[PDB]
Design a protein around this nucleic acid. Structure first.
Ligand SMILES: [Mg+2]
Ligand SMILES: [Mg+2]
Ligand SMILES: [Mg+2]
Ligand SMILES: [Mg+2]
Ligand SMILES: [Mg+2]
Ligand SMILES: [Mg+2]
Ligand SMILES: [Mg+2]
Ligand SMILES: [Mg+2]
Ligand SMILES: [Mg+2]
Ligand SMILES: [Mg+2]
Ligand SMILES: [Mg+2]
Ligand SMILES: [Mg+2]
Ligand SMILES: [Mg+2]
Ligand SMILES: [Mg+2]
Ligand SMILES: [Mg+2]
Ligand SMILES: [Mg+2]
Ligand SMILES: [Mg+2]
Ligand SMILES: [Mg+2]
Ligand SMILES: [Mg+2]
Ligand SMILES: [Mg+2]
Ligand SMILES: [Mg+2]
Ligand SMILES: [Mg+2]
Ligand SMILES: [Mg+2]
Ligand SMILES: [Mg+2]
Ligand SMILES: [Mg+2]
Ligand SMILES: [Mg+2]
Ligand SMILES: [Mg+2]
Ligand SMILES: [Mg+2]
Ligand SMILES: [Mg+2]
Ligand SMILES: [Mg+2]
Ligand SMILES: [Mg+2]
Ligand SMILES: [Mg+2]
Ligand SMILES: [Mg+2]
Ligand SMILES: [Mg+2]
Ligand SMILES: [Mg+2]
Ligand SMILES: [Mg+2]
Ligand SMILES: [Mg+2]
Ligand SMILES: [Mg+2]
Ligand SMILES: [Mg+2]
Ligand SMILES: [Mg+2]
Ligand SMILES: [Mg+2]
Ligand SMILES: [Mg+2]
Ligand SMILES: [Mg+2]
Ligand SMILES: [Mg+2]
Ligand SMILES: [Mg+2]
Ligand SMILES: [Mg+2]
Ligand SMILES: [Mg+2]
Ligand SMILES: [Mg+2]
Ligand SMILES: [Mg+2]
Ligand SMILES: [Mg+2]
Ligand SMILES: [Mg+2]
Ligand SMILES: [Mg+2]
Ligand SMILES: [Mg+2]
Ligand SMILES: [Mg+2]
Ligand SMILES: [Mg+2]
Ligand SMILES: [Mg+2]
Ligand SMILES: [Mg+2]
Lengths: 56, 90
RNA sequence: CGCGGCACAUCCACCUUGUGGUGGGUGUGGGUAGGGGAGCGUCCCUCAUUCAGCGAAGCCACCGGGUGACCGGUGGUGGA
RNA sequence: GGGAUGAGCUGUGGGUAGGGGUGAAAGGCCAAUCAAACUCCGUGAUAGCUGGUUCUCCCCGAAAUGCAUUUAGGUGCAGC
RNA sequence: AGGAUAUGUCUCAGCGCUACCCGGCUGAGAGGCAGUCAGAAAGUGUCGUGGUUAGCGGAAGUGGCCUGGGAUGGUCUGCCGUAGACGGUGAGAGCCCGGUACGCGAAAACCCGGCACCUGCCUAGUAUCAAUUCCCGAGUAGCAGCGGGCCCGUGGAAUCCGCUGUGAAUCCGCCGGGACCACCCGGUAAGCCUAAAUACUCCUCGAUGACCGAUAGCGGAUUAGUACCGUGAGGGAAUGGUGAAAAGUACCCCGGGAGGGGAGUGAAAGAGUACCUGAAACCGUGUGCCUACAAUCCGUCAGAGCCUCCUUUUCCUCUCCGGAGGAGGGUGGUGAUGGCGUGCCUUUUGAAGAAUGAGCCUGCGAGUCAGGGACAUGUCGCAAGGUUAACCCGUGUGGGGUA
RNA sequence: GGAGCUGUCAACCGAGCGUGGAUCCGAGGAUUUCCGAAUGGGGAAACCCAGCACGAGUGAUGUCGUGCUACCCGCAUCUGAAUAUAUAGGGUGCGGGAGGGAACGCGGGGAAGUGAAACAUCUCAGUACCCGUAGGAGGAGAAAACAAUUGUGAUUCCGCA
């Protein structure tokens, strides 16, 4: 299981699909409009996996 | 429903798209209304209207354009009231 | 036996020179019980992509196609 | 055709219940079923027995013998 | 337990015969602690950012053009999103509707928690010595007979349970450690109570499904445990779909009606309450060819002749014609005539068999699943190592977990 | 809660109600025929016939309404037969039980088909079924326990062994 996950992430990184951000919305309240604008800035593809901490 | 018997409405979908009439009777269980002069019907003797879906009409705000219905917390005296959006007052 | 098509096994030479293909010889290819190998069609799910009220599915007819289960094209009927 | 004042026939009400009843005795009858009723359950009983078992092609391809068997129309091992 | 060294939650009153020491008991008050509990039981209040039983609000397109009966479709544009769950609306709708994210909401009743009231318990025995005496659950244990149950089917048969008989001991006791004995070790039977971790779903809410979709799924989408069958216990069915809207065909004609024709509604009546689509068996009507001198597992190969529709020629050249016809060729239908030819399945040494099964069509109807099972193989990971089980933490399929 | 409504098959009507808040939803209360454990007595369940007390009605019988009246067990009281002590029994007054429910628990009774290629020991299986009796769970539970020269320390359930 771990080897497969590592291989998949390695493929993503090798093709350059790993992005790193500080946080999604500079405020303390949610805002889908600005979050979507930021994601569209990062990416123009359909399926995006957002990995964020459980406390955000 | 938010559409009442005495109201004036605008048809937004169907054959009579763009017609203005007043509700004649409402069927809350069926979600249908009788608007005057819409989707007339040729019945047989021995041309009335047939009800249309309340989803297909929008309440004219009595101040011009049609609007979606909201509720302003009256009461203040002594119950709730039904108002407009888009220049809300009713 | 002649001429043409197919398949299995093997030999001889190349391309990854047995993962498998390419070229030529040679041998083989009746089959019940039964063993082994490779496929067709139906339905559901996931991923990608592509058609559909300018007409999907289903059904009917005709014209074609493949070594087999079977497939396609056109038209009609139909209505998701 | 037999009996037809009798060991008669019959109505109404009641009793005996399944290895139990009842039987002037035939294994008769006990709801069109009786050498052990019927219903549900055990239960999808079990059957060395009969029947059935659904698409395709390619390669190979038997046995009906020996031994043993509460065995001989079954099975185990060998042979193929 | 009872005896010798040692002393009083605090006070008051009463009693323990009288004056005293030492006390002890009861009652009251003062304190401390506990509480609806296994360890004692009820009830009255009052208060919850507590819960359950109704609910409410809740962002954003009347957008242009095309097709269309209808836009939720196509294509241009605008927007919301803590809401792009789901469903409805005249066809695939986040912005039309019910809703969804989110956030509010309880007279009263019930439940849970708190604080009080209330209720109860605690009124010196601690420590040391003595080691004489008493107590430590009786028709019990033990033993024997016959059984049951334990891995243990009576066996060398321990431990546990029943009936019958016999029948103790109180710690220098008694029971167990797989016959039994000695030593050692462990424990203290014959009195009671005790949460949690575990099992289940008639039922009530909320979700979900590589579950079914009307011969399926519950027997039951339809009057369903109904109709019907049986004296009875019992057994036990079949029956869904017009259309977006009923706009369900006014009026005329034939007819006793039923039914139909014309009009009319509808996008459609090639949707007419016998109604979505509408297969097959089966039943007609019309039409092309063949068939009344022939012996036929009903086909197959050879094959003339007719009929039909396309095409290369010589002609009606009227020809811009179009094709009448002729000659050839080709589709398709039919098949005069000639040869060959013993249905399918099962089961058999051997079946066309006069052995079995099948009237026909449509639907349904048979090697599946479970388990760190066993053996053998293909493939992938790690490798002298490989791997976790239960379980714990996570919205998941993820991370831990060495027994 | 806020404008329509008088449930459905299932329409046709008739007649009405509703912002002075209807229909609808929630909670509490009232009423609640007869049968059924059925319980005054009887009975072919849904029927029949009473007694007592209190009211209603009649000129008076007739008639009506509302309560109570089963049996067993426990407790408290009065009485104490044959018969003397007394007891059995009897009267009174208070409490309780009975019946139902899909599964799950505990205690007791307990098959056969089947497998053993026959069959009786054995298996199936302490299963099916039956009886008693629960609770939201139950049962078990605080060593007259294991272990073995070290030690663990009530019970239950899960995984190994
Ligand atoms: Mg062959
Ligand atoms: Mg074969
Ligand atoms: Mg159309
Ligand atoms: Mg399909
Ligand atoms: Mg087609
Ligand atoms: Mg089609
Ligand atoms: Mg009788
Ligand atoms: Mg005889
Ligand atoms: Mg008979
Ligand atoms: Mg019998
Ligand atoms: Mg018998
Ligand atoms: Mg069985
Ligand atoms: Mg061969
Ligand atoms: Mg609302
Ligand atoms: Mg148009
Ligand atoms: Mg839609
Ligand atoms: Mg949707
Ligand atoms: Mg709508
Ligand atoms: Mg025994
Ligand atoms: Mg023994
Ligand atoms: Mg004894
Ligand atoms: Mg020993
Ligand atoms: Mg003791
Ligand atoms: Mg106990
Ligand atoms: Mg417990
Ligand atoms: Mg059915
Ligand atoms: Mg169907
Ligand atoms: Mg009957
Ligand atoms: Mg028309
Ligand atoms: Mg149509
Ligand atoms: Mg149609
Ligand atoms: Mg029909
Ligand atoms: Mg039809
Ligand atoms: Mg002739
Ligand atoms: Mg002949
Ligand atoms: Mg012939
Ligand atoms: Mg011949
Ligand atoms: Mg024979
Ligand atoms: Mg035959
Ligand atoms: Mg024959
Ligand atoms: Mg024969
Ligand atoms: Mg025969
Ligand atoms: Mg035979
Ligand atoms: Mg036959
Ligand atoms: Mg599988
Ligand atoms: Mg392996
Ligand atoms: Mg009410
Ligand atoms: Mg009520
Ligand atoms: Mg009675
Ligand atoms: Mg009685
Ligand atoms: Mg006396
Ligand atoms: Mg009871
Ligand atoms: Mg037996
Ligand atoms: Mg046997
Ligand atoms: Mg047998
Ligand atoms: Mg209870
Ligand atoms: Mg208990």
């Amino acid at each position: 299981i771990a080897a497969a996950l590592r291989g998949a992430l390695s493929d993503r990184a090798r093709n350059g699909r790993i992005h790193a951000i500080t946080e999604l919305v500079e405020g303390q309240n949610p805002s889908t409009k600005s979050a979507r604008a930021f994601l569209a800035s990062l990416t123009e593809r359909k399926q995006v996996l957002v990995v964020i901490g459980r406390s955000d | 429903m938010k559409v009442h018997k005495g109201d004036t409405v605008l048809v937004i979908s169907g054959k009579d798209k763009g017609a203005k009439g007043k509700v004649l009777q409402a069927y809350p269980d069926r979600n249908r209304v009788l608007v005057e002069g819409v989707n007339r019907i040729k019945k047989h003797t021995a041309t009335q209207e047939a009800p249309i879906h309340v989803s297909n009409v929008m309440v004219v705000d009595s101040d011009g354009k049609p609007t979606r219905i909201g509720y302003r917390v009256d009461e203040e005296t002594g119950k709730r009231v039904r108002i407009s959006k888009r220049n809300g007052k009713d």
